Amino acid sequence: TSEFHLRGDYLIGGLFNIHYVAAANFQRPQAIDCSSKLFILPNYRRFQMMRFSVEEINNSSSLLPNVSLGYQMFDHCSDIHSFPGIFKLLSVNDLIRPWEDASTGLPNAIGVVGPFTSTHALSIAPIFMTNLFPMVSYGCSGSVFSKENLYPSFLRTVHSNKDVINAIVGIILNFNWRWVAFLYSDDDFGKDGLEQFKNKIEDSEICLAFYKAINVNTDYLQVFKQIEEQNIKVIVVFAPKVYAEAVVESAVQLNVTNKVWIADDGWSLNKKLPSMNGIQNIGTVLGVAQPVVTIPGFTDFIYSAIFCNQKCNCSNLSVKSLLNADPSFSFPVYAAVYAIAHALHNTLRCGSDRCPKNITVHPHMILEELKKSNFTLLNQTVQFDENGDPKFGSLSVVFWNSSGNAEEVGSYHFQSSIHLSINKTKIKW
Amino acid sequence: DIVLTQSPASLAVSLGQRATISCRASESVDSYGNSFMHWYQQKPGQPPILLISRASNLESGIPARFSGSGSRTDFTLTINPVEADDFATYYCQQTNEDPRTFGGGTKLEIKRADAAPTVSIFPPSSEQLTSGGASVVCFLNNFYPKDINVKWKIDGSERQNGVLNSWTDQDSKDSTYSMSSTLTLTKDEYERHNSYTCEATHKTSTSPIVKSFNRN
Amino acid sequence: EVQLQQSGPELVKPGASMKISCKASGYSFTGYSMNWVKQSHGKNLEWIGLINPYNGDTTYKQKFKGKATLTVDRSSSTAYMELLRLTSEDSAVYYCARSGRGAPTTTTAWFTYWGQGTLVTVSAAKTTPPSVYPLAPGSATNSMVTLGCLVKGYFPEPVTVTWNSGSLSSGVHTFPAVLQSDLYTLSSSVTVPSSTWPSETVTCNVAHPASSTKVDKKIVPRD
Amino acid sequence: PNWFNNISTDLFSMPGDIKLGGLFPIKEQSNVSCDSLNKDGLGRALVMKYAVEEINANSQLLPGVKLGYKIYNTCRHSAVIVRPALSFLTEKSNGTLSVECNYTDYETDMVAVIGPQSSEMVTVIGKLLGFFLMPQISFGATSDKFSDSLVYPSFFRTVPSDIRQVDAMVQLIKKFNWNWVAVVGSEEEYGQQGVQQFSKKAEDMGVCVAYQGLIPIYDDPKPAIQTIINNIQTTEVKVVVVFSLVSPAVSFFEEVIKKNLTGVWIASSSWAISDKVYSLPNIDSIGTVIGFIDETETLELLSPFTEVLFKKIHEASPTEKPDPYNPCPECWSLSPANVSLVKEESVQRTAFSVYAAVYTVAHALHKLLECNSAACKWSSSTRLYPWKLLEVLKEFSVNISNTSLKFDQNGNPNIGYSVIQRIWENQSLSSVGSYRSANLSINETLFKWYTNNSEKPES
Ligand SMILES: *[C@@H]1O[C@H](CO)[C@@H](O)[C@H](O)[C@H]1NC(C)=O
Ligand SMILES: *[C@@H]1O[C@H](CO)[C@@H](O)[C@H](O)[C@H]1NC(C)=O
Ligand SMILES: *[C@@H]1O[C@H](CO)[C@@H](O)[C@H](O)[C@H]1NC(C)=O
Ligand SMILES: *[C@@H]1O[C@H](CO)[C@@H](O)[C@H](O)[C@H]1NC(C)=O
Ligand SMILES: *[C@@H]1O[C@H](CO)[C@@H](O)[C@H](O)[C@H]1NC(C)=O
Ligand SMILES: *[C@@H]1O[C@H](CO)[C@@H](O)[C@H](O)[C@H]1NC(C)=O
Ligand SMILES: *[C@@H]1O[C@H](CO)[C@@H](O)[C@H](O)[C@H]1NC(C)=O
Ligand SMILES: *[C@@H]1O[C@H](CO)[C@@H](O)[C@H](O)[C@H]1NC(C)=O
Ligand SMILES: *[C@@H]1O[C@H](CO)[C@@H](O)[C@H](O)[C@H]1NC(C)=O
Ligand SMILES: *[C@@H]1O[C@H](CO)[C@@H](O)[C@H](O)[C@H]1NC(C)=O
Ligand SMILES: *[C@@H]1O[C@H](CO)[C@@H](O)[C@H](O)[C@H]1NC(C)=O
Ligand SMILES: *[C@@H]1O[C@H](CO)[C@@H](O)[C@H](O)[C@H]1NC(C)=O
Ligand SMILES: [Cl-]
Ligand code: NA
């Protein structure tokens, strides 16, 4: 068998990226061998969270009774080389027919969970939107996906960049520093972050004194030299794991000192940086974070676990390292699967102990139910607004404390007069 | 607390000429590669208006006639050329450390040609005579400079008791001052005399300017 | 554009308390500190403190701790300063002023926008309307003639004076009041062409808001 | 010329041994129903027809090989454009797209793509075509985003990147000593990138950008347009750069006129020669309009060719041949009374961009098939893989008519700009200068200032 494939009455696509590789020119039109590249522990954890969710639903005799959920999952380390997997999900015979109707025609899968990053989604989503094939992303935070008319069958189980940027602005307004540097990844995620940041601070006392696109070619000596010359104390770093690590590692090496760092929720629960040698010297690290949401049964599931782009090559893996990895986006994966599973259940007009078998399921039928999702899950209420954004999930403020943990020191109030509160006593500057 | 001392406390500068005003801080007001001294203009009865921030940055809206310079503890505001509506008090302010403090201000007067006052005297109105009060009013209008002496004379005899004097601020068009002098009596004491005289002495002449009425 | 609108003049008894307001409009209210400034009759400017309207954090100059209390109401975009246990020493003009944009810290911000200021009179004495007498040239001509009216015995400030309800602007001198026995007196003069009086009328319109008294006096020659 | 006599009446589909895909904004939404004819787009599509008929007539260019194509409407809409883009990738023998991990030996139905026109549309299909390493040559999409081959692996264009147009604009603004400007863009890829590029360059050259705002293209744009104009008035700028697609530009300038604003307006190439803006009532009252358009040759054979074609279409018009994805249903009624489509200024001055994209591919193929003037190393068993053609297009040099076209490593052409000005009195465009390499060359004396005293505004 394989981790990446599970047969079932209905299939869910799973789009993950559990290896990392920098973009490179290529000379042939062919998939990349992602299994020989850099392993990403926390992404593999979210990969397992989907496998766990499906298995849990298949163990249930009340949700989808006697109707099994299968999946085809992929490790797309390159968004541009992800199309073979995407075609597989959308094909009706290991064939794609470009003019095929949204109604008549039964694709391999009924919907797809993922992908993780905005870049991955932008490359592929239009092909899915065409026949209203539902995508429920567990990670995509680009604000442009809130535009229904551009992304009619795209939903997500995480917050948009606007929410996190509001929280970050909230953190800054709570203290006294008003010059700010903004280091953002040179990609769709980071650039949307920068625009939202500029928009939010424009009519405020906050001055954006320096900003810079972070990419593989970044000369960090000059970045920090420019920051230091402008006497900037607050540095926002809006960037995924690889770029956030490069920034912070470089700062340690270049003797950057006495700063106030602010992380987005993509690296404020990073597990490598808080115990890295010399981390203490760069100053204080604050962040917006996803609260740790406990997923009962997952620990047990993990002990018991350990076509192109369906190979892990991760066999000598420490169960403990995987368990303790950045658990961000966990409930978003879990809810994304459950949302599709409920949508199928209701589309089949399943009852309590059996589902009818006279109903033919089309992806756009799954979409209609998904949009009116309304169900409880680990005591949260899963729903999406008109734009397909989640109406669940909160954000908290964290401070990297002396024992290497991301201590909760505050929370972000989506709807209240003081939008962000912080117990300032907990922060040891 | 940073103490700011301005100098001079006041100055008079002719139309078209240069006004120099300085501000000295008891400690440096530098940090973040900047000097946090600002200059504000205030006209009587109005909120202060910001001219210059961070020693030398001219705020938008503010004429190029204003400019600042300095760092650490010594700062200067230059008004050049001075225009008629620049009469005001100018304040420095440091924002380098809590608490923010201001200098005691420098009062800029517009200098112009000496002008004699125009003197008018008014008897008590009948309406006030009824209520038992008698105010005799003398206007000494549009003179320069502001220094002036008014004496009241009743039946040829001088009186100092009961006189209240009030001065306007400098006119923004012609840069002169005006002054009122009010002699308040009882109706009774008022009717005890005939001639009432208001007498203005000003540097524009060695002869007093004299206005009288007879009560009858 | 940005406006800061402070509440009107107030007379208040010694020992009482009072709350001044400053309504902000035309910008994002929680984005900037609101400062408060005191100016006594001697005209020294004095920073009272500031409030972060985003969260309500306050910072005070030491001598105003326990004398002044800054608050905001985010739902109405309004900052407030409450002055406690007033002495005659608290008689002053109080300003609100918004921090600008460009300083490295909330500490270093300068003041780019100001309210119009609120005059606070702390007196035990009582509100008293003005008497208004005409000042007519007493039986004396030249090319231009000077008239006036005397505004006597009012309390507290302020009084406004106009001539012909505004049409007479130039050649007007309105003198600052003088305080006597807990009562204010001022006068206003107006100089008009000899040919335009007593021909065309000249009246002075006084207003004392503190007693809502509004009065006219047309100036009539003497005989 | 004679070969005009043997042209086929097929607009959007021509049979051939080797075929190109074409993507043109032929019919659009009024404001998924694509019912509004886009005459510029239909006009550009006709240029491709002309280029291909001409290439086939040329006995020495692809001697043994017949070039054909399929052209589809994009509707400038992502759902609409995806289907033809995939159709280009179907197996040549099958009509279907195989699911594979390796397409090295996979013979697509088309060997290269012409278009699409708009940058938003390139962001929809660019990475899909880039995976297949299928050459894509746009005649219209100018966003600098496409200048990165690590992101857009097979993208070329016959029009320069907007990173150069904003540099032309900032150089003009410096030359006239304007230092306080506003910049307005349409809220989508083209306008967004144009505003950002402009703001960065203006700052580099010490130009203070007073205000910066975007015109919505989806939601009703009037509220934001009012906000935008309010800021322009309060900042008191007398120079505004409008880096915008036509429809938002139209909406913007409608309001500019209503509020009777006057100033200097700097037009990006998308509306600078647009009849839609210039025919608005009282547009002539907004002042001075200085525009930047692609520096192009005129195709003097395009109009004559189109007269002949529209004749032949009138002749064959009693025939019937039905299609849910007809690029242009009403085009069956084309008579010579519709040649106006290619006589239109906006088409005449951009036609060469389409023509150069088609010819670039033809010459690249001629080279790939080891052709000389007599024969090509080609037969009915030859297998053409787009990735092989791509290998040839990399850094391609070719002479087309009087133009020596060179593509750099980014897929960008060595093509510059003409600077023009709208002359209100005789509804015309005059040439006030050029931009070539990184050199702006204008003649200040040639400029007319629609100001009170006809002097150049402000300082
Ligand atoms: C697994 O990845 C490593 C690189 O980390 C590579 O050297 C090795 O060949 C891969 N193993 C397999 C079985 O593919
Ligand atoms: C599902 O049931 C099996 C036993 O049938 C159990 O071993 C497994 O742990 C359960 N899985 C989940 C995800 O609950
Ligand atoms: C459950 O479904 C399976 C296949 O879908 C079928 O074989 C079986 O009869 C069903 N079981 C019951 C109890 O209905
Ligand atoms: C080295 O590190 C210290 C840390 O306090 C810093 O102050 C100092 O300026 C650094 N030196 C250089 C050359 O960066
Ligand atoms: C969601 O479901 C609950 C429980 O049935 C129901 O009471 C509630 O009305 C629903 N909420 C919405 C917003 O539809
Ligand atoms: C740091 O935070 C963690 C997690 O909240 C907690 O276990 C620990 O007590 C904290 N350590 C210190 C020194 O505050
Ligand atoms: C704030 O933080 C400290 C720990 O540093 C904690 O002891 C205290 O309980 C917290 N205060 C509140 C009000 O929660
Ligand atoms: C893909 O196919 C080509 C041609 O058949 C072959 O040369 C190449 O090695 C294949 N790619 C891989 C990754 O095996
Ligand atoms: C050509 O002209 C006719 C008559 O003016 C018009 O109705 C028709 O729509 C035109 N065709 C096109 C393609 O614009
Ligand atoms: C091609 O281009 C070169 C350089 O521009 C030119 O000199 C030459 O004449 C051209 N050759 C042909 C065959 O068109
Ligand atoms: C229109 O008028 C301009 C002068 O403003 C002139 O130079 C130009 O030749 C005229 N246009 C045409 C097409 O004749
Ligand atoms: C610019 O145009 C003017 C007016 O036509 C003409 O006098 C001059 O020769 C031209 N200058 C240059 C440098 O070509
Ligand atoms: Cl297009
Ligand atoms: Na089940």
Chains that touch A (3 or more CB pairs under 8 A): B, C, D
Q: Which residues pair with C57 in a beta bridge?
A: none
Give the CATH H-level superfamily of domain B1-112: Immunoglobulins (2.60.40.10)
Strand D97-98, strand A95-96: pairing:
antiparallel
Cβ contact A107:A89 at 8 Å: yes
Are B36 and B95 in contact, with CB atoms under 8 Å apart?
Answer: yes
Helix, strand, or coil (residue C69): strand
Task: Show the DSSP H helices in D88-118 as ranges.
Answer: none
Q: Which amino acid is at B182?
A: T
Residue B189 phi, psi (nearest 5): -65, -35
Taking the domains of chain B in order of start, what are their residue ranges? 1-112, 113-216
**Is D29 annotated as contributing to ligand binding?**
no
Q: Is B33 on the interface with A (CB under 8 A)?
A: yes
Structure tokens of A25?
């020119």
Q: What is the dihedral of CA A37, A42, A43, A48, to 10 degrees?
A: 120
Of all protein residues, the one whose alpha carbon is nearest to atom 8 of ligand 10 is D399
Asked if A96 contacts D97 with a C-beta cutoff of 8 angstroms, the reply is yes
Contact D305, D53 (CB under 8 A): yes
The secondary structure of A362-400, three-state, reads: CHHHHHHHHHCCCEEECCEEECECCCCCECCCCEEEEEE
Query: How many CB atoms lie under 10 A from the CB of residue B215?
Result: 16
Phi then psi for A381, rounded to 5 degrees? -110, 115
D150 with A84: Cβ contact below 8 A: no
Residue nearest to atom 3 of ligand 1 (CA): A36
Ligand 12 atom with minimal separation from the D444 CA? 1
Contact B93, B38 (CB under 8 A): yes
β-pair partners for A138: none
- Please spell the DSSP secondary structure of D117-137, one letter per residue: SSHHHHHHHHHHHHHTT--EE
Residue C149's SS3 state is strand
Are B50 and C110 contacting, i.e. CB atoms less than 8 angstroms apart? yes
Please answer yes or no on whether A207 and C102 come within 8 Å at the CB atom. yes
**Backbone CA torsion sign across D373, D377, D383, D389:** negative
One fold for B1-112 and B113-216:
yes
Beta bridge partners of B92: B39
Strands B19-25 and B74-79: antiparallel
D8 is annotated as contributing to ligand binding:
no
Chain C nearest-CA distance from A245, in A, is: 27
- Cα–Cα distance list, D20 to D68, D111, D122, D331, D359 (Å): 6, 6, 17, 21, 11
CATH 2.60.40.10 domain position(s) in chain C: 125-223
Report strand pairing: C78-83 vs D287-294. Answer: unpaired
Q: What CATH number does the domain located at B113-216 have?
A: 2.60.40.10
d(CA D126, CA D372): 33
Q: What is the DSSP letter of D161?
A: -
Residue with tokens 């429809």: D247
Instruction: Give the span between the Cα atoms of C4 and D310, in whole angstroms.
Output: 69
Resolution (A): 2.2
3-state SS record for B34-46 = EECEEEEEECCCC
Partnered with residue A381 across adjacent β-strands are A376
Q: How far is CA D2 from CA A286, B151, D308, D315, in A?
A: 76, 115, 11, 19
Alpha-carbon span C146 to C191, nearest angstrom: 4
Mutation probe of ligand 1 site: the residue of A35, A309, A315 with most atoms within 8 A of C-beta: A35
Give the other-Cβ count within 10 Å of D15's Cβ: 11
Ligand 11 close to Cβ of residue D428 (< 6 A) = yes
Of A205, A233, A421, the CB nearest to C106: A205
The Cα D22–Cα D20 span in angstroms is: 6
Mutate to test the interface with A, among D94, D101, D125, D133 (most CBs of A within 10 A): D101
- Of all atoms in ligand 6, which is nearest to the CA of residue A401? 1
Closest CA to A204 of C33, D196, D212, D227: C33
Of A84, A129, A149, which has the smallest distance from its Cβ to D99's Cβ?
A84
From residue A72, alpha-carbon distances to A11, A12, A52 in Å are 7, 6, 14
Question: Which ligand is closest in space to the CA of residue D432?
Answer: 12
- Using DSSP, state whether A52 is helix, strand or coil: helix
What structural domains does chain A harbor?
A: 5-158+293-382 (3.40.50.2300), 161-291+394-426 (3.40.50.2300)
Q: Is D116 left (phi over 0), alpha (psi -120 to 50) or beta?
A: beta
- Residues A339, A340, A344: CA angle, nearest 5 degrees: 120
CA distance D398 to D377: 20
Tokens (6 digits) for D54: 């001409």
Mark residue D89 as left, alpha or beta (left: phi above 0; alpha: psi -120 to 50; beta: remaining). Answer: alpha
Residue carrying structure tokens 């009024």: D30
- The amino acid present at C137, given as its one-letter code, is P
Alpha-carbon distance of D9 to D198, in angstroms, equals 44
Phi, psi angles (nearest 5°) of residue A256: -65, 125
Q: Cα–Cα distance between A96 and A119 in angstroms, integer?
A: 23
Query: Cα separation of A393 and A412, whole Å?
Result: 11
CA distance A271 to D19: 53
Confirm if C102 and A179 have CB atoms less than 8 A apart: no
Distance CA D291, CA D381 (A): 50
How was this structure determined? It was done by X-ray
Of D99, D102, D128, the CB nearest to A95: D99
Query: Which residue's C-alpha comes closest to atom 13 of ligand 10?
Result: D399
Select from A423, A427, A428 the residue to mutate for testing ligand 7; criterion: most ligand atoms less than 8 Å from CB: A423
C125-223 CATH choice from 1.20.1510.10, 3.40.630.10, 3.40.630.30, 2.60.40.10? 2.60.40.10
Q: Which residues of C touch A231 (CB under 8 A)?
A: 104
Cβ atoms of B72 and B35 closer than 8 Å: yes
| C-beta of residue A179 within 8 angstroms of C-beta of residue B32 | yes
Cβ neighbours around A281 below 10 Å, total: 13
Name the residue type at position B59: E
First to last CA, chain C: 55
User: Please, are residues D73 and D27 in contact by the beta-carbon 8 Å criterion?
Assistant: yes
Chain centroid to CA B103: how far?
18
Q: Tell me how far the alpha carbon of residue D106 is from its chain's centroid.
A: 30
Q: Tell the residue number behind the tokens 């509804």, with chain if given.
A: D427
Distances A153 to A148, A331, A366, A368 between C-alpha atoms, Å:
8, 21, 10, 9
Return the SS3 of D453: coil
- In the block, which residue shows the tokens 């019919």? D27
